[PDB]
């Protein structure tokens, strides 16, 4: 009989429905209940959990048929946890206007269109064949289907409950099936021994909420948990001291930044935005708070972007001489500028802010913290500077320079960034182009416009730390999720 796995977690997601559950805490549970048509093989070819190789999963085979359509041949006889057979009807429903991207659908799945390409209606050609397609050119359909957008839901069962009720009683095809949810306390899953893939190695997996990281460290020391989540490099020394325990860390595909409400007169133009960007000494922050474990990216550029990653890109400029020149050029009069942060919701948010307040003071700018309480929502008119984070969810450069800072999106529409026409033309174009010299050059150029305009200032790629018993073999992956397929063995 297999061991029961117990994971001490920072929290539980608001839903277990694949899109509504998208969060720092959802994917780790959702990845076990559901399968996608394509799976990202993080450990392929000896990689330490960071490979972007996409391999077929519920799709037995696929063939791209033109610049915007892919014919998928599905695995036959695969069952959902309730006994329903997985067919083209279910895959077409998953990426349909009715469930995901239509006007009525986004009323219950609010990010269904935001995390999707320009989908056209799926076409069911036979019981196990479906064409997934876009209205305009798209060579990213494969990447979107291998992302957190991809999980396949059962048509009849999902339709009879709806997105919110499905999220509290989810049915998928994955290696573990939903047993129970006690809101903000635990989610228990039980082994799906009818799983089309490899036999699950745990009898059950419990995701138990433990708000305090110190209480989680004690839970691992005592024997309440096998694996614990959401630690920082400072907690590594206490855990490693125990010979039967060890820390397991990795860089995650997320980016910490600060952004500006550009409707405010002081941030309507790029001048003072650039001054605050050039005054930030990023290695001094990563040395003092992240134990040099965080990585400072060279532009809005990451190795998981694949063919749109530029390793020869120069790092982001730190120049206090230029920063002081821009402060005076902007007409900045010395009024304190607020920096909103909901405490340390993002790791090291307040200590990073306090370090930057000194670096901005050196440049001639007074920035004060506006530490808002959990449960509060500051009104947009009261925001000058605010911290933010963007999960780089696709294995492509589109997420999040285009998906967040592009045309019609919130940074330009809600926060007022007047982006140059070239940025919006290249954003619309790179969504359509296939990987080549033209696509890679357009991203390198978009990155340059991003730095000149400074609608956000990138700080660093965070370092996520897990801790686990040495008798549980599991390696983390470079994304905010947990993968147990070919990566969960008990000693």
């Amino acid at each position: 009989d297999r061991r029961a796995l117990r994971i001490g977690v920072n929290g539980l997601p608001p839903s277990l429905e694949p899109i509504n559950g998208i969060s720092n805490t959802g994917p780790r549970i959702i990845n076990q209940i559901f399968d996608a048509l394509i799976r990202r093989d993080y450990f392929a070819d000896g990689a330490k959990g960071n490979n972007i190789k996409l391999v077929p999963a519920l799709a037995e085979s696929f063939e791209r048929i033109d610049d915007k359509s892919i014919r998928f041949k599905l695995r036959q006889g695969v069952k959902f946890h309730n006994g329903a057979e997985m067919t083209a009807e279910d895959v077409a429903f998953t990426f349909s206007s009715e469930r995901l991207w239509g006007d009525e659908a986004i009323k219950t799945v609010p990010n269904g269109r935001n995390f999707s390409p320009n989908w056209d209606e799926p076409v069911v050609e036979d019981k196990y064949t479906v064409v997934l397609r876009t209205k305009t050119p798209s060579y990213l359909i494969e990447k979107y289907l291998g992302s957190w957008l991809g999980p396949i839901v059962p048509k009849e069962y999902y339709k009879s409950l709806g997105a919110v009720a499905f999220g509290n009683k989810p049915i998928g095809t994955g290696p573990y099936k939903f047993r129970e949810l006690v809101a903000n306390d635990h989610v228990t899953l039980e082994a799906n021994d009818g799983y089309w893939g490899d036999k699950p190695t745990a009898s059950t997996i419990t995701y138990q909420v433990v708000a305090e990281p110190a209480t989680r460290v004690a839970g691992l020391i005592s024997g309440e948990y096998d694996i614990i989540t959401t630690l920082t490099p400072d907690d590594m020394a206490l855990v490693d001291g125990y010979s039967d325990l060890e820390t397991r860390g990795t860089l995650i595909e997320n980016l910490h930044m600060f952004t500006f409400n550009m409707n405010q007169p002081i941030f309507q133009n790029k001048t003072l935005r650039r001054a605050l960007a050039l005054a930030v000494n990023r290695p001094l922050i990563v040395e003092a708070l992240w134990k040099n474990k965080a990585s400072i990216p060279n532009g809005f550029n990451f190795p998981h972007y694949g063919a749109t990653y530029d390793p020869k890109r120069k790092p982001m400029e730190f120049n206090l001489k230029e920063a002081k020149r821009l402060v005076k050029e902007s007409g900045y009069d010395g009024t304190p500028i607020t920096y909103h942060t909901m405490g340390n919701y993002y790791a090291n948010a307040v200590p990073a802010l306090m370090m930057m307040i000194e670096m901005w003071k050196a440049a001639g700018i007074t920035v004060v913290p506006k530490i808002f309480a959990p449960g509060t929502t500051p009104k947009d008119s009261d925001i000058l500077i605010r911290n933010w984070s963007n999960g780089q969810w696709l294995t492509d450069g589109l997420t999040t320079m285009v998906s967040e800072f592009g045309p019609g999106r919130g940074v330009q529409k809600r926060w007022g960034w007047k982006a140059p026409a070239e940025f919006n033309n290249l954003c619309d174009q790179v969504a359509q182009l296939k990987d080549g010299e033209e696509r890679s050059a357009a991203f390198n150029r978009l990155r340059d416009i991003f730095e000149d305009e400074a609608p956000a200032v990138l700080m660093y790629q965070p370092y996520d730390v897990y801790a686990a018993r040495k008798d549980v073999q599991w390696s983390p992956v470079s994304f905010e999720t947990m993968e147990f397929r070919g990566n969960l063995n008990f000693k």
Side-chain angles (χ1 to χ4, degrees):
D1 205 52
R2 297 157 293 187
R3 281 179 67 191
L5 183 72
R6 294 184 53 81
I7 310 168
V9 298
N10 57 318
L12 288 175
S15 189
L16 296 165
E17 190 276 346
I19 308 306
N20 295 343
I22 286 165
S23 47
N24 174 260
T25 64
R28 69 171 63 113
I29 312 183
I30 292 153
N31 193 28
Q32 324 309 327
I33 299 157
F34 307 86
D35 299 290
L37 295 171
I38 292 161
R39 176 168 59 80
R40 178 179 165 187
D41 204 13
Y42 311 95
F43 303 101
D45 312 327
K48 298 277 197 84
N50 64 350
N51 208 333
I52 64 173
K53 195 200 189 155
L54 297 181
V55 302
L58 291 179
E60 189 168 90
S61 60
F62 62 95
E63 277 201 66
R64 180 168 271 271
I65 70 172
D66 63 18
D67 67 348
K68 63 214 213 211
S69 324
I70 307 173
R71 179 170 292 109
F72 287 93
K73 189 55 164 160
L74 307 172
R75 284 168 175 273
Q76 309 186 6
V78 174
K79 290 282 197 230
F80 282 104
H81 302 144
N82 65 347
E85 199 200 356
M86 195 276 301
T87 76
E89 283 266 311
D90 302 295
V91 172
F93 180 69
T94 301
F95 307 104
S96 68
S97 170
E98 194 196 334
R99 179 264 171 169
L100 188 62
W101 51 276
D103 289 58
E104 195 66 50
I106 66 173
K107 290 173 181 210
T108 62
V109 180
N111 286 319
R113 190 185 287 162
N114 292 324
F115 300 154
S116 283
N118 191 13
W119 292 128
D120 199 352
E121 198 60 34
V123 176
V124 169
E125 295 174 312
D126 71 51
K127 200 175 178 183
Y128 307 98
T129 311
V130 55
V131 173
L132 300 179
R133 45 167 197 168
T134 53
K135 296 162 142 67
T136 50
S138 187
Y139 284 95
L140 304 173
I141 299 163
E142 298 90 334
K143 294 186 181 151
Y144 277 97
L145 299 170
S147 82
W148 55 22
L149 185 74
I152 299 306
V153 303
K155 186 179 172 177
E156 300 312 312
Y157 175 88
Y158 189 106
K159 274 173 83 183
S160 79
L161 271 73
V164 52
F166 179 86
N168 298 322
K169 194 104 177 208
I171 289 285
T173 58
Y176 294 90
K177 59 206 196 166
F178 176 73
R179 188 194 260 179
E180 57 173 318
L181 155 71
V182 177
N184 308 315
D185 181 63
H186 80 270
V187 166
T188 302
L189 314 179
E190 65 168 72
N192 177 23
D193 293 321
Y195 181 56
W196 64 272
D198 293 356
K199 193 198 188 186
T201 64
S203 56
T204 55
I205 302 165
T206 301
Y207 295 91
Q208 175 60 62
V209 177
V210 181
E212 289 281 67
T215 305
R216 245 138 55 203
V217 171
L220 184 78
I221 289 156
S222 54
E224 200 73 57
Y225 315 111
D226 293 298
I227 300 158
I228 58 167
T229 70
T230 322
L231 307 177
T232 42
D234 294 16
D235 315 281
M236 290 174 70
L238 174 63
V239 174
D240 294 324
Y242 295 86
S243 46
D244 290 318
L245 310 171
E246 60 180 6
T247 52
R248 297 185 197 161
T250 179
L251 283 176
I252 52 150
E253 293 160 6
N254 204 298
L255 180 48
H256 281 193
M257 72 191 79
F258 61 90
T259 183
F260 314 92
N261 173 359
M262 293 165 268
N263 289 277
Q264 302 286 21
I266 200 49
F267 302 132
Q268 289 179 8
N269 76 359
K270 73 187 178 166
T271 314
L272 198 72
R273 294 204 303 257
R274 281 272 292 172
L276 292 155
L278 293 160
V280 179
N281 176 358
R282 302 170 183 82
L284 190 80
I285 294 160
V286 170
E287 186 217 58
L289 308 172
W290 292 88
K291 297 197 176 286
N292 293 301
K293 301 289 187 295
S295 176
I296 297 153
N298 290 337
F300 217 142
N301 184 29
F302 295 84
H304 78 283
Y305 286 5
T308 54
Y309 163 65
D310 183 8
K312 303 269 67 161
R313 201 176 162 81
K314 297 178 192 279
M316 299 177 296
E317 189 187 342
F318 162 52
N319 193 353
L320 182 59
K321 286 124 188 302
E322 183 58 7
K324 286 169 183 154
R325 189 193 73 76
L326 293 162
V327 171
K328 295 284 177 180
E329 191 179 66
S330 73
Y332 173 70
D333 69 1
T335 301
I337 312 176
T338 56
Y339 186 117
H340 276 85
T341 185
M342 185 175 82
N344 289 324
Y345 177 73
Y346 305 129
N348 289 304
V350 176
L353 170 55
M354 301 317 292
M355 286 190 76
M356 295 188 293
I357 284 168
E358 294 300 315
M359 298 174 195
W360 291 318
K361 169 170 161 201
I365 320 149
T366 290
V367 179
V368 287
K370 181 76 177 181
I371 304 176
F372 60 110
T376 73
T377 168
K379 63 191 180 270
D380 290 11
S381 73
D382 296 348
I383 286 143
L384 268 292
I385 313 163
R386 56 163 289 206
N387 60 188
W388 202 28
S389 91
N390 277 185
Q392 304 299 284
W393 50 273
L394 290 178
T395 52
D396 190 71
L398 198 85
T399 51
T400 47
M401 187 154 58
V402 172
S403 68
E404 295 296 338
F405 301 83
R409 323 305 209 283
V411 175
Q412 292 188 33
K413 194 153 183 94
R414 187 197 185 171
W415 303 100
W417 180 40
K418 177 173 85 176
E422 191 190 351
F423 191 86
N424 293 347
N425 285 343
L426 291 161
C427 283
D428 292 333
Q429 234 73 265
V430 302
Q432 292 200 11
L433 295 170
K434 56 179 153 195
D435 284 311
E437 292 292 345
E438 182 142 52
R439 186 148 200 266
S440 291
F443 274 101
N444 168 74
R445 176 56 190 164
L446 281 168
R447 274 153 208 158
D448 288 349
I449 295 157
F450 188 89
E451 270 165 66
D452 299 332
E453 289 283 328
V457 179
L458 309 186
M459 291 161 68
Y460 42 61
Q461 190 185 354
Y463 190 83
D464 203 346
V465 180
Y466 294 86
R469 291 176 54 76
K470 293 194 164 189
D471 69 11
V472 172
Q473 191 193 100
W474 167 84
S475 287
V477 304
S478 70
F479 204 78
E480 288 159 285
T481 195
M482 296 177 75
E483 177 68 271
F484 307 129
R485 294 165 183 82
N487 187 40
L488 181 64
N489 308 110
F490 299 100
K491 302 194 170 184

